[PDB]
Design an enzyme around this catalytic site. Structure first.
Site, PDB file in Angstrom:
ATOM      1  N   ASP A  57     -25.444  37.656 -89.711  1.00  0.00           N
ATOM      2  CA  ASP A  57     -25.434  37.540 -88.236  1.00  0.00           C
ATOM      3  C   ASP A  57     -26.726  38.158 -87.705  1.00  0.00           C
ATOM      4  O   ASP A  57     -27.124  39.270 -88.182  1.00  0.00           O
ATOM      5  CB  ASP A  57     -24.205  38.255 -87.656  1.00  0.00           C
ATOM      6  CG  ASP A  57     -24.046  39.677 -88.182  1.00  0.00           C
ATOM      7  OD1 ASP A  57     -23.909  39.849 -89.402  1.00  0.00           O
ATOM      8  OD2 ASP A  57     -24.005  40.634 -87.356  1.00  0.00           O
ATOM      9  N   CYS A  74     -22.142  28.172 -86.865  1.00  0.00           N
ATOM     10  CA  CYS A  74     -22.134  29.545 -87.329  1.00  0.00           C
ATOM     11  C   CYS A  74     -21.060  30.279 -86.543  1.00  0.00           C
ATOM     12  O   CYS A  74     -19.910  29.747 -86.430  1.00  0.00           O
ATOM     13  CB  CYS A  74     -23.547  30.114 -87.273  1.00  0.00           C
ATOM     14  SG  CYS A  74     -24.411  29.998 -85.706  1.00  0.00           S
ATOM     15  N   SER A  75     -21.382  31.449 -86.046  1.00  0.00           N
ATOM     16  CA  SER A  75     -20.477  32.192 -85.150  1.00  0.00           C
ATOM     17  C   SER A  75     -20.503  31.535 -83.755  1.00  0.00           C
ATOM     18  O   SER A  75     -19.499  30.897 -83.393  1.00  0.00           O
ATOM     19  CB  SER A  75     -20.971  33.632 -85.084  1.00  0.00           C
ATOM     20  OG  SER A  75     -22.363  33.656 -84.775  1.00  0.00           O
ATOM     21  N   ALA A  76     -21.604  31.620 -83.006  1.00  0.00           N
ATOM     22  CA  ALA A  76     -21.679  31.021 -81.646  1.00  0.00           C
ATOM     23  C   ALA A  76     -22.242  29.589 -81.660  1.00  0.00           C
ATOM     24  O   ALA A  76     -22.182  28.892 -80.633  1.00  0.00           O
ATOM     25  CB  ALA A  76     -22.489  31.898 -80.760  1.00  0.00           C
ATOM     26  N   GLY A  77     -22.837  29.164 -82.772  1.00  0.00           N
ATOM     27  CA  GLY A  77     -23.378  27.817 -82.930  1.00  0.00           C
ATOM     28  C   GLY A  77     -24.746  27.699 -82.272  1.00  0.00           C
ATOM     29  O   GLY A  77     -25.097  26.573 -81.873  1.00  0.00           O
ATOM     30  N   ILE A  78     -25.528  28.776 -82.219  1.00  0.00           N
ATOM     31  CA  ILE A  78     -26.885  28.733 -81.589  1.00  0.00           C
ATOM     32  C   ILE A  78     -27.959  29.422 -82.439  1.00  0.00           C
ATOM     33  O   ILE A  78     -29.049  28.933 -82.426  1.00  0.00           O
ATOM     34  CB  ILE A  78     -26.872  29.227 -80.126  1.00  0.00           C
ATOM     35  CG1 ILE A  78     -26.586  30.727 -80.003  1.00  0.00           C
ATOM     36  CG2 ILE A  78     -25.942  28.349 -79.302  1.00  0.00           C
ATOM     37  CD1 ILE A  78     -26.576  31.227 -78.610  1.00  0.00           C
ATOM     38  N   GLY A  79     -27.686  30.551 -83.091  1.00  0.00           N
ATOM     39  CA  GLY A  79     -28.724  31.353 -83.791  1.00  0.00           C
ATOM     40  C   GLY A  79     -29.075  30.727 -85.128  1.00  0.00           C
ATOM     41  O   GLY A  79     -30.103  29.996 -85.269  1.00  0.00           O
ATOM     42  N   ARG A  80     -28.230  30.922 -86.120  1.00  0.00           N
ATOM     43  CA  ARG A  80     -28.370  30.318 -87.455  1.00  0.00           C
ATOM     44  C   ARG A  80     -28.299  28.776 -87.336  1.00  0.00           C
ATOM     45  O   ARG A  80     -29.118  28.052 -87.992  1.00  0.00           O
ATOM     46  CB  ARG A  80     -27.318  30.934 -88.369  1.00  0.00           C
ATOM     47  CG  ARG A  80     -27.523  32.441 -88.563  1.00  0.00           C
ATOM     48  CD  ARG A  80     -26.388  33.095 -89.313  1.00  0.00           C
ATOM     49  NE  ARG A  80     -25.326  33.384 -88.323  1.00  0.00           N
ATOM     50  CZ  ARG A  80     -24.242  34.051 -88.633  1.00  0.00           C
ATOM     51  NH1 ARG A  80     -24.061  34.480 -89.874  1.00  0.00           N
ATOM     52  NH2 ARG A  80     -23.327  34.295 -87.684  1.00  0.00           N
ATOM     53  N   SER A  81     -27.369  28.236 -86.556  1.00  0.00           N
ATOM     54  CA  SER A  81     -27.240  26.759 -86.422  1.00  0.00           C
ATOM     55  C   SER A  81     -28.545  26.209 -85.837  1.00  0.00           C
ATOM     56  O   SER A  81     -28.999  25.106 -86.228  1.00  0.00           O
ATOM     57  CB  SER A  81     -26.064  26.412 -85.546  1.00  0.00           C
ATOM     58  OG  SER A  81     -24.845  26.866 -86.138  1.00  0.00           O
ATOM     59  N   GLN A  92     -31.934  32.833 -81.913  1.00  0.00           N
ATOM     60  CA  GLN A  92     -31.441  34.017 -81.179  1.00  0.00           C
ATOM     61  C   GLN A  92     -32.335  35.233 -81.390  1.00  0.00           C
ATOM     62  O   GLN A  92     -32.039  36.242 -80.777  1.00  0.00           O
ATOM     63  CB  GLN A  92     -30.019  34.314 -81.638  1.00  0.00           C
ATOM     64  CG  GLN A  92     -29.002  33.414 -80.932  1.00  0.00           C
ATOM     65  CD  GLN A  92     -29.055  33.733 -79.452  1.00  0.00           C
ATOM     66  OE1 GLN A  92     -28.641  34.798 -79.070  1.00  0.00           O
ATOM     67  NE2 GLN A  92     -29.648  32.862 -78.614  1.00  0.00           N
TER      68      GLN A  92
END
Length: 293
Positions: free
Chosen positions: A185, A219-226, A258
């Site tokens: 994360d 991913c978690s929120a669907g913005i950083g890693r995604s 992110q």
């Protein structure tokens, strides 16, 4: 082949030696377009959103066809110029796993790419929306079931082969579930090789090709890693102004990438990728039993 370094390699050298990754990231944040997200914020959708300040835009949100409430926290990220589209979504909630699989069915998706762990820093980031053993997982609310067919366990990722059944029509589709298990994360992959070995494993399945619906990236929120995964894949296809490509992709889903380190990583992956898949595989140490037969 050109001796002249690409516009991207030129940018990377300046930003590194001038230490401008944080200021460049600031520019992208301030230059990012804002669009309405009224549907995300209807009171009846509160329990459909994992996080209060990550919402899909009304203009690009994926609609659940034929449902009393059509809302899912999912965005269609369309890069015509690259002939790429993706659906980027949050880690499904216990109550939205049924909506996730309805979406996968309706959009003719062939691959799910999961870039998070279920629990990160003692916080649940995602429901267990696929089976961990031979038990059929039922989603009664939308009429789907998922079976684990087989799994390919590597040292830092797993490929799960899933059977999604529309229990009403009796129809089935096999879904490739690409689970990156070591991407922290608000973090970056271990190396460009590790990330590229993974992206090309996804590519080599055909799931990103236009004969299929969009791949679902989360991913978690669907913005950083995604957003990292999609930005790198989209730029490799186009191979370019990475800053402009990212701002265009952000028109379809808020907040893609992110951290400044995720942006720097995106540069490094694109420069490594733009060139070898056997070097990535060995350098990734993907193999749990590398012993020759």
């Amino acid at each position: 082949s050109n001796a002249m370094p690409t516009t991207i390699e030129r940018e990377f050298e300046e930003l590194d030696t001038q230490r401008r990754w944080q200021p460049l990231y600031l520019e992208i944040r301030n230059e990012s377009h804002d669009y309405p997200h009224r549907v995300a914020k209807f009171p009846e959708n509160r329990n459909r959103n994992r996080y209060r300040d990550v919402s899909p835009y009304d203009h690009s949100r994926v609609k659940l066809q034929n449902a009393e409430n059509d809302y899912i926290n999912a965005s269609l990220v369309d890069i015509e110029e690259a002939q790429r589209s993706y659906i980027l979504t949050q880690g499904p909630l216990p109550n939205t796993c049924c909506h996730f699989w309805l979406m996968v069915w309706q959009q003719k998706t062939k691959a799910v790419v999961m870039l998070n762990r279920i629990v990160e820093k003692e916080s649940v980031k995602c429901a267990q929306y696929w089976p961990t053993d031979d038990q059929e997982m039922l989603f009664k609310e939308t009429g789907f079931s998922v079976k684990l067919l087989s799994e390919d366990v590597k040292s830092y990722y797993t490929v799960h082969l899933l059977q999604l059944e529309n229990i009403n029509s009796g129809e089935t589709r096999t879904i490739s579930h690409f689970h990156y298990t070591t991407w922290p994360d608000f973090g970056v992959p271990e190396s460009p090789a590790s990330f590229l070995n993974f992206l090309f494993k996804v590519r080599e399945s055909g799931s990103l090709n236009p004969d299929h619906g969009p791949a679902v990236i989360h991913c978690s929120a669907g913005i950083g890693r995604s957003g990292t995964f999609s930005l790198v894949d989209t730029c490799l296809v186009l191979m370019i102004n990475i800053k402009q490509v990212l701002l265009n992709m952000r028109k379809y889903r808020m907040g893609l990438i992110q951290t400044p380190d995720q942006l720097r990583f995106s540069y490094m992956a694109i420069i490594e990728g733009a060139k070898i898949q056997k070097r990535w595989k060995e350098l990734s140490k993907e193999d749990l039993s590398p012993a020759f037969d």
